[PDB]
Design a protein around this ligand. Sequence first.
Ligand SMILES: O=P(O)(O)O[C@H]1[C@H](OP(=O)(O)O)[C@@H](OP(=O)(O)O)[C@H](OP(=O)(O)O)[C@@H](OP(=O)(O)O)[C@H]1OP(=O)(O)O
Lengths: 84, 218
Amino acid sequence: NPGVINNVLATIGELAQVSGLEMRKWVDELFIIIMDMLQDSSLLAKRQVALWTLGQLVASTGYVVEPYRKYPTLLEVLLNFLKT
Amino acid sequence: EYTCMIPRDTHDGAFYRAVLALHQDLFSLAQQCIDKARDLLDAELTAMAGESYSRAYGAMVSCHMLSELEEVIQYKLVPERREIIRQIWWERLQGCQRIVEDWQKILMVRSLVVSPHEDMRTWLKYASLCGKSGRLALAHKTLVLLLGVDPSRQLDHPLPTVHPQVTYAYMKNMWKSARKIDAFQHMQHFVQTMQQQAQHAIATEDQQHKQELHKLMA
Ligand SMILES: O=P(O)(O)O[C@H]1[C@H](OP(=O)(O)O)[C@@H](OP(=O)(O)O)[C@H](OP(=O)(O)O)[C@@H](OP(=O)(O)O)[C@H]1OP(=O)(O)O
């Protein structure tokens, strides 16, 4: 069930909001995981919670422009959610 | 008094009402106005983003400016995150398109809590951008505001040696715009009174100042 995934995403977003700049050593793997759960969604999982916790670990760590080139498909999949 | 007549159903109305409510410490109304402006802008964003990204940048800059108001809330709420958001602001401003028209409004929504005398690393770049874009009369105003005293009124008094980056940029602007002779003597005097300064600075621990002064002298 996706309940465990939603729960761990919500708690990890709350944790990233609690501890800022002490999670920069983890944001890369979190990005690689959460973009593969957001984009190329093989299942109909909750995308709003993933989007929220993704936006929550970039306002605390300060990952502003680097992910736009480290993951060249981030802007396109962020823009598609307005038409899908 | 002016915002009371702006329509409440448009994006600019919600944006300005959020800014006004934020000015008087209303952290609950401002969030609601921000969340309303979010969708009021998302409408035209998804209407315009279907063509191209370069066409939707005009709404993306506004969405970015709107998403920087929550960081103003965090600035006025938690004193421990002030320097961190003040640094991510500078890190995020380096990604936008170098145009004075949007830089002005971004810095205005940003200076709601940060005076120009508190983060001048981002205002010197703004002055240089205004100088390169042919708008030298705005670069002069920005440099004068950063300095604190307008040297164009006292043609005989020297330039304020404090804030060395600001006076260096001011001398560059004076050389570029109008006068190629006065800026030369000004730079000579500045180099003299700046080299006569590092001698009395025997720094044993703070080594983040001597190297910067040496680079500036170079
Ligand atoms: O445009 P220039 O008159 O040639 O001056 C440049 C310019 O800085 P300014 O325009 O603010 O003076 C560079 O920055 P950009 O505008 O080109 O991005 C800056 O390099 P930085 O980006 O690292 O600040 C460089 O400094 P440097 O010579 O160390 O490369 C500096 O040259 P000068 O200060 O010597 O004029």
